[PDB]
Amino acid sequence: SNNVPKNASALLRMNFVKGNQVLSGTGSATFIAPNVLLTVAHNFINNSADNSTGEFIGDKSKNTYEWQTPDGQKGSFTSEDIHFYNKKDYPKGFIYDLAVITLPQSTRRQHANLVENYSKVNVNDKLNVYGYPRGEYAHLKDTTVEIEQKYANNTYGVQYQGGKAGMSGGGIFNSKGEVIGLHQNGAENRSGGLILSPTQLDWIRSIIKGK
């Protein structure tokens, strides 16, 4: 499992369509089943005009998205394949910036494991975070947790140095190489991510066990 985190780390390409015009962006995701990706909701949605709900970037019926792994393999998906943890309350905080993508059953990729049991991450813990800042592969090796934020019971944001734009959606890994969280912010307003709660882990597994 030495190379399992790296080889599960996918680049995301997003093509947001509006009318007959398209704008593109990039992000990151992690394979946690042969045909299931973990990522952030904000690769796909943003705040509604009044911040009351999450809302698709571009036209959801026209958008196209793509994943690519380090070995060069790639595949496509659409909005029909995206499962948001909570699109309605997405604007309320990073606790809801969470999404799972179910790819076709013909996708049979090697993947990392979602952690079986929740383990609280503490300040001064060292994490391993993978992603594609500016679309380029990057591994934040043993980056230290400096600040924690309790979003809800057993639901913590953590801050660690290293993230830049494009890395959001990349995986946070424990020392065994299991997925425990995901990177969410690499902008100038503090790099960090979300450590998945027992509830969020169960929800992801419910999506996996549909596949």
Residue numbers in the entry: -1, 684 to 893
What does the paper say about this structure?
Immunoglobulin A proteases (IgAPs) represent an interesting group of proteolytic enzymes that have convergently evolved to specifically cleave the unique hinge region present in IgA1 from humans and great apes via several different chemical mechanisms. The M26 IgAP family can be split into two subfamilies with distinct domain architectures. The subfamily represented by the Gemella haemolysans IgAP (GhIgAP) contains an additional trypsin-like domain (GhTrp) found N-terminal to the IgAP domain. Prior studies that compared GhIgAP constructs with and without this domain concluded that GhTrp had no effect on IgA1 proteolysis.
The 1.75 Å resolution structure of the G. haemolysans M26 IgA1 protease trypsin-like domain is presented. To gain insight into the structure and potential functional role of this domain, we solved the crystal structure of GhTrp and demonstrated that the domain does indeed possess a trypsin-like protease fold. This fold, however, contains many unique changes in the well characterized surface loops that are known to contribute to trypsin-like protease specificity. As expected, the GhTrp crystal structure depicts two molecules in the asymmetric unit, related to each other along the c axis by a tNCS vector of approximately half the c-axis length. Despite having low sequence identity (<20%) to most known chymotrypsin-like and trypsin-like proteases, DALI analysis demonstrates that the fold of GhTrp is consistent with other members of the S1 family of glutamyl endopeptidases, as categorized by the MEROPS database. Loop 1, which contains the serine nucleophile (Ser167) and the oxyanion-hole residues (amides of Ser167/Gly165), is similar in structure between GhTrp and BGP but is truncated when compared with bovine trypsin. Taken together, these data suggest that the GhTrp structure could represent a pro-enzyme-like form of the putative zymogen in which some activation event is required to properly stabilize loop 2 in an active conformation to generate a viable S1 pocket. We hypothesize that this putative pro-enzyme form must undergo a specific cleavage event to generate an N-terminal segment that interacts with loop 2 to stabilize a more open and active conformation of the S1 pocket.
